[PDB]
């Protein structure tokens, strides 16, 4: 991992206070998206 290869803070937003269940939440979102991408063939 080259340090010069990393970006700067100008393009890196940060977030804190993440709930434990958020992972599962994401999963749900993902599967939802899955159905969506299954309905569109383009």
């Amino acid at each position: 991992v080259n340090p010069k290869q990393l970006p700067a803070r100008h393009n890196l937003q940060v977030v804190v206070a993440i709930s434990p269940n958020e992972k599962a939440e994401r999963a749900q979102k993902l599967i939802s998206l899955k159905q969506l991408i299954a309905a569109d063939a383009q």
Binding site: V1, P7, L12, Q13, V14, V15, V16, A17
Partner: protein, 289 residues
């Protein structure tokens, strides 16, 4: 090609700056923090008389805990601490890597939970609390490591100027540390290893068990014997004033300087609940209750 006269002038300037900063910070913060800690355990209200039976009402402790529980339920509730997020796909491959790295460094390497708990519980009574991170370069089979030494830092071992309101515009910032003689020998006086010697009162009064100015059993000649060193960050033109106001980190011992270098950012961070605009220190639960 650093001259010794330059270093002597720097020592004099830094000594007077530390004197002023201490004279200010003492009556600014510690005079209140000591009594706040005393009220924490209800030891300040004295038994004026035997027949009075002055049963103390532990109220500050109660609010402190009521706030600390929610604080930890906010940040430390999740299995992870944070997670970086980007705005484009060209830099998303680095977000997850940085997130994993910082999480490992903070939790799987350091006791981030204890650090946060200490920075919180001590902040709401001391009006502030500090956290710090350095580059650990320990070495002994001569394995050498480069770690991110993150650690809590009390407010009793900090000294700052009065005209400052944030780390950005801070002109002078000192932090006494207790480091073994090994690290000092790694940078100065190899032939001499016998360089012996409010900040202690406030600490020994946060509780009533510890006494930092005692001997836990370490021999003075033992290289691992901990010794007080003075670390400072100063914005000043120690060179020709015509030069830019460069920031410099200095690390010295008693009447001896060990390290000097340039740096454009203070690795210290401060917590400021109920902050006070135009000032470097916020409020505290003590002053409210």
């Amino acid at each position: 090609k650093y001259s010794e006269e330059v270093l002597d002038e720097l020592r004099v300037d830094l000594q007077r700056r530390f004197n002023y900063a201490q004279g200010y910070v003492d009556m600014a913060v510690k005079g209140y923090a000591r009594e706040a800690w005393e009220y924490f355990y209800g030891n300040l209200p004295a038994p004026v008389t035997a027949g009075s039976s002055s049963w103390v009402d532990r109220t500050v402790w109660e609010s402190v805990n009521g706030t600390l529980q929610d604080i930890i339920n906010v940040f430390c509730s999740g299995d992870e601490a944070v997670t970086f997020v980007a705005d484009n796909q060209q830099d998303s491959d680095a977000a997850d890597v940085a997130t994993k790295l910082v999480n490992q460094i903070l939790l799987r390497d350091n006791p981030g939970y204890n650090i946060i708990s200490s920075a919180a519980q001590e902040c709401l009574v001391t009006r502030n609390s500090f956290i710090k991170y350095y580059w650990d370069e320990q070495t002994s089979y001569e394995q050498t490591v480069k770690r991110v030494k993150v650690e809590y830092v009390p407010s009793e071992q900090i000294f700052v100027d009065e005209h400052a309101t944030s780390f950005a515009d801070a002109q002078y910032f000192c932090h006494r540390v207790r480091r073994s003689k090994e690290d000092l020998v790694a940078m100065g006086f190899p032939k001499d290893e016998i360089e012996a010697f409010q900040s202690t009162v406030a600490w020994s009064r946060t509780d009533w068990r510890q006494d930092i100015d005692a001997d836990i059993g370490t021999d003075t000649e033992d290289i691992a014997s901990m010794v007080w060193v003075y670390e400072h960050y100063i914005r000043t033109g120690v060179l020709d004033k015509n030069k830019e106001s460069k920031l410099y980190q200095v690390i010295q011992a008693g009447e001896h300087i060990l390290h000097t270098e340039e740096v454009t950012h203070i690795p210290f961070v401060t917590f400021c609940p109920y902050p006070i605009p135009g000032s470097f220190y916020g409020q505290s639960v003590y002053d409210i209750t």
